[PDB]
């Protein structure tokens, strides 16, 4: 049995890591949580510490208010009976206001003004959380890459329940919160628009999703192949190239006729991924605003 490095063979533990300081305000950073021997076998064993600020609490608040506002309504539908609640859990839905209410806030609670409430709560919670991904990096003096990549996911999310329903003139065009319900909205969207497969952006969105899975499978497997040369320490192979970096590049050169660099591969990474929700956000935004039917469009445009 040759050892493949998928699971840690022997864990070690040492003093809880409180982490680098730099310009971070340490008054807002919590204390260390427990150590999971379970987690240990795969990644780190150390939970925490977690930084929680004025913005970190705002986010963490709204995000729950968003999660409650829905489940309150999910209880309402259950008739406040836990057995039904559990049973019907995927069938519950909080739905956007009826089209007759257009873009107003006038729509009553049981008619979807309760939707708007939770939606607001979401909107606050997400951007405030995007606030974090920029700020935590600024504090450590690192790149904003996480902030920008996040922004890419936010894109599709803004298109879906915000930007598009505004351009379509009503909130009813938005996505309902519920497990089976939003699944239907997705499928329903396809039919309404003439088989979304004919949208050239879904064409690409799906390619990048597929490619994200292909590349991270390549990358991940690769680093694990060269981990015996300490491949996982990518940054110090960036500053000083190890045989790990060479053997990596060379597998792929010899296989596919070209290759990457240890900093380079991560640019392939960040992009291939980002472009999923990047493209796919456009594809949606264009649907119903500009192109009503993707089949139809597909006959007149290439």
């Amino acid at each position: 049995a040759e050892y493949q490095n998928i699971f840690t063979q022997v864990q070690v533990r040492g003093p809880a890591d409180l982490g680098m300081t730099e310009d971070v305000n340490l008054a807002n950073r919590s204390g260390v949580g427990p150590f999971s021997t379970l987690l240990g076998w795969f990644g780190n064993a150390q939970l925490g510490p977690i930084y929680l600020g004025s913005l970190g609490v705002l986010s963490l608040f709204s995000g729950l208010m968003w999660f409650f506002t829905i489940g309150i309504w999910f209880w309402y539908q259950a008739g406040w009976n836990p057995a039904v609640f559990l049973r019907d859990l995927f069938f519950f839905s909080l739905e956007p206001p009826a089209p007759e209410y257009g873009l107003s806030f006038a729509a009553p609670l049981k008619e979807g003004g309760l939707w708007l409430i939770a939606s607001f709560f979401m909107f606050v919670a997400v951007w405030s959380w995007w606030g974090r991904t920029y700020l935590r990096a600024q504090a450590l003096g690192m790149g904003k890459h996480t902030a920008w990549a996040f922004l890419s996911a936010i894109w599709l999310w803004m298109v879906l329940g915000f930007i598009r329903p505004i351009l379509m003139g009503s909130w009813s065009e938005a996505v309902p919160y519920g497990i089976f319900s939003h699944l239907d909205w997705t499928n329903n969207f396809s039919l309404v628009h003439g088989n979304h497969f004919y949208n050239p952006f879904l064409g690409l969105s799906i390619a990048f999703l597929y490619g994200s899975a292909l590349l991270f499978a390549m990358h991940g497997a690769t680093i694990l192949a060269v981990s015996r040369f300490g491949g996982e320490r990518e940054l110090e192979q960036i500053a000083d190239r190890g045989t790990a970096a060479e053997r990596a590049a060379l597998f792929w050169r010899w296989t596919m006729g070209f290759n990457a660099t240890m900093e380079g591969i991560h640019r392939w990474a960040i992009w291939m991924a980002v472009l999923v929700t990047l493209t796919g956000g456009i594809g949606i935004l264009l649907s119903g605003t500009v192109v009503d039917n993707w089949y139809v469009w597909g006959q007149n445009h290439g």
Binding site: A1, E2, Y3, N5, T8, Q9, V10, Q11, V12, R13, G14, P15, D17, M20, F35, T37, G40, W41, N44, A45, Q46, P200, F201, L204, S227, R228, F229, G230, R233, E236, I238, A239, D240, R241, G242, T243, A244, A245, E246, R247, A249, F258, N259, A260, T261, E263, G264, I265, R267, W268, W271, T279, I282, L286, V290, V291, W297, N300, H301
Partner: protein, 240 residues
């Protein structure tokens, strides 16, 4: 048509994106060489990028890439054929020479620093408050080689401090000297630690570290290169 515009606009963006991504990935190994080390004629459609310079932490200098490409070591290979595209046979002992699967890059002769400027890797005796938290503790386990002979015993675990993980097993030999075995190349069992990559006669060959409180980027590469190479090279003495 708006969408038709968007999508055209995208295919043009994506071409330039692939250009940028490819040029960026040319910051090492390029310009290409012929087998004799002279710059090759055909470099491909992609130009070298305008160079960048990294500021290494803790006064370690800088790195500018792309840059002058030299191996900074002697290569123990000679051509096996009269034309391009053929294997290059080692002249000497490829393990000792450091070629093929035993190849090593000549990287800095200083150890890797953690965020605070202390060495990333210390043996666990010198690691303060570091202890095995799970799995079988290998320390004191006899080490067997692919030829199923005892190569000596495990006298410590060299651990990565900031990632809190094992890296090497320091192994003591017959003559009482120790070598570092990469963790990824050892299978710690119930009754022993097993190394498939090397037979026992090859252990004494494992490149040695100078200050044995620490190990350096160059010394890791020499040891990791060495042990990995043994797979191909120790093949005659490997049973099973």
């Amino acid at each position: 048509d708006l969408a038709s515009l968007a999508i055209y606009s995208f295919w043009i963006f994506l071409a330039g994106l692939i250009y940028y991504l490819q040029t960026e990935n040319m910051r090492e190994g390029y310009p290409l060489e012929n087998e004799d080390g002279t710059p090759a004629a055909n470099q491909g459609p992609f130009p070298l990028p305008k160079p960048k310079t990294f500021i290494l932490p803790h006064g370690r200098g800088t790195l500018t890439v792309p840059g002058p490409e030299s191996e900074d070591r002697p290569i123990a290979l000679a051509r096996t054929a009269v034309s391009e595209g053929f294997p290059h046979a080692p002249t000497g002992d490829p393990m000792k020479d450091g070629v093929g699967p035993a190849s090593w890059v000549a990287r800095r002769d200083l150890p890797e620093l953690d965020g605070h400027g202390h060495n990333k890797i210390k043996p666990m005796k010198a690691a303060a408050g570091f202890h095995v938290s799970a799995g079988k503790n290998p320390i004191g386990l006899p080490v067997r080689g692919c030829d199923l002979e005892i190569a000596g015993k495990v006298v410590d675990i060299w651990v990565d401090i900031p990632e809190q993980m094992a890296r090497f097993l320091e192994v003591e030999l017959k003559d009482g000297s120790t070598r570092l075995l990469p963790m990824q190349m050892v299978k710690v069992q119930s009754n022993r630690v097993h190394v498939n990559a090397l037979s026992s006669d090859l252990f004494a060959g494992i490149p040695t570290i100078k200050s044995p409180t620490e190990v350096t980027l160059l010394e890791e590469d020499k040891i990791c290169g060495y042990v990995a190479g043994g797979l191909m090279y120790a093949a005659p003495k490997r049973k099973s």
